[PDB]
């Protein structure tokens with residue numbers, strides 16, 4: 218049955234902003250993160266130390282990590298694609314880093330020319346450098362509920378790659394529905410396989426609402442026992458491998474369900490909707506949070 | 514657990530259209546229903562024989578029911594408040610009628626003008642005449658998961674009114690979250706008290722997505738046993754009592770879940786999307802269906 222409390226992992230400033238059409242100034246990014254920190258979130262994905270040549274929406278990763286207020290207890294994990302970035306994150310003050318993989322071969326090759334195993338070496342380097350450095354590492358396993366190339370993905374595979382992630386060092390893995398094509402049935406089947414090899418407390422869910430399935434899939438996870446789920450503020454985000462629809466689950470909409478369920482989150486909805494409205498104006502877009510819409 | 518098959522009640526032409534700003538021509542409605550019929554739905558709430566005063570978007574109710582094609586095996590229920598409306602439906606050919614109440618006292622006042630027991634008089638009349646004629650009768654219990662005027666609504670109070678409707682002659686009753694403020698836990702409590710008084714086959718759910726909870730509340734109903742749910746085409750409709758936000762559960766996003774769940778619905782999603790695109794343009798709006806947005 219449902220957990221007494223859930224740790225929400227806010228990805229609005231990295232997963233969300235990275236996949237947004239308009240860009241925002243550094244001071245806006247910092248303001249947004251500061252609002253999210255004050256909103257109550259205990260973990261906020263701050264940026265990604267990635268080569269500006271590739272993803273330029275994150276080019277201010279250095280100045281954004283040193284400019285935000287480090288609230289007591291809150292975590293500000295950053296993405297580090299490679300040793301070089303992980304090196305930049307460290308020297309910039311990061312105390313937890315995130316790495317991303319996939320339970321799909323075609324997806325990995327079309328995004329890094331390396332088979333699913335070839336990708337572990339690279340991560341291995343970071344996980345070795347992070348341990349001696351005493352820095353935590355979170356993992357991402359996309360295509361958990363399906364792939365835009367291979368299509369259906371065997372639960373078995375998702376589990377294999379997650380186990381490899383957990384045993385390799387990651388204290389937590391985010392099983393993500395990158396293209397948002399999963400339905401409660403798949404979430405269940407996928408999670409069942411994973412729980413056999415990886416201890417529940419280390420599991421997280423990252424569902425995109427590309428087809429209106431994010432919340433329902435998330436609920437199924439909670440029923441399975443997962444206690445941590447990712448979400449973007451105003452539903453910011455989006456997937457490059459999915460048409461014009463939406464991206465990440467709307468945090469304001471998740472905490473709403475969680476509160477009706479009497480599940481502790483420690484988040485202040487009102488202060489959160491405020492952060493959502495803020496970033497949305499600075500981005501000249503309309504929120505994708507239904508809760509936010511029913512309040513305006 | 515989940516049912517093998519689910520009867521989707523399409524309320525786009527009625528619930529969805531009645532709660533929309535821009536009104537439509539009689540021939541558009543007729544084409545929307547005809548298109549829905551082709552999409553595969555087995556029941557399409559056609560219209561409402563109600564005063565053109567209270568709701569004029571439903572004024573063309575007689576000619577509408579008369580002009581729509583009557584696809585074989587597909588039901589076309591119509592709303593009937595007083596006996597005046599019902600005795601006007603049988604004339605127009607109606608084979609099934611929909612009486613509509615609410616567990617909320619304060620709400621009943623504003624919708625059908627009278628109180629709860631004063632609505633049991635009116636309905637008893639309708640259910641009497643309909644039985645000795647073979648005219649099925651469905652009922653709506655608004656505020657099933659709360660009221661916009663009374664706030665919290667008791668699960669037993671909703672079990673009371675549902676029992677009554679079922680004890681008079683309603684072959685089926687639709688419990689609705691008129692303002693979409695429900696969360697899985699509340700749906701589960703409500704459905705529970707109700708299943709004590711009324712059998713499961715006569716139960717249905719009508720969730721609004723104002724707060725983005727509709728599909729999740731629905732899934733709780735499915736896990737609870739219910740096998741017939743209400744939804745509206747392009748997510749047509751709205752919360753007239755709440756801010757200008759989402760209305761009904763998008764029929765397309767619902768069949769997307771059910772199909773991924775391997776549940777039989779009998780609907781051809783491609784044609785459903787077409788009907789959705791048709792009325793959305795007639796209404797000049799954008800679809801609220803996430804699946805439609807992801808489809809192109």
Ligand SMILES: CC(C)(COP(=O)(O)OP(=O)(O)OC[C@H]1O[C@@H](n2cnc3c(N)ncnc32)[C@H](O)[C@@H]1OP(=O)(O)O)[C@@H](O)C(=O)NCCC(=O)NCCSC(=O)C[C@@H](O)CC(=O)O
Nearest residue numbers: 562563564565567594597598624625626653655689691719
């Ligand atoms: C007549 C009532 C008793 C009111 O009483 P009142 O108006 O005070 O006087 P009356 O003597 O009863 O007569 C009323 C006036 O109406 C005329 N009249 C009576 N019956 C009819 C009829 N069938 N068709 C046309 N006119 C009629 C009559 O000739 C007279 O008119 P004139 O020719 O002007 O002299 C009432 O039935 C009504 O008008 N109701 C309006 C309907 C409404 O608001 N429906 C919403 C859909 S439900 C939802 O969205 C939730 C669902 O989705 C679930 C979920 O998700 O939550």
Ligand SMILES: O=C(O)CC(O)CC(=O)O
Nearest residue numbers: 232265272296298317393
């Ligand atoms: O969408 C995600 O969650 C992962 C990102 O696209 C990975 C990246 O660009 O580094």
Ligand SMILES: [Mg+2]
Nearest residue numbers: 232393395423
């Ligand atoms: Mg993502």
Ligand SMILES: [Mg+2]
Nearest residue numbers: 528689691719
């Ligand atoms: Mg309704």
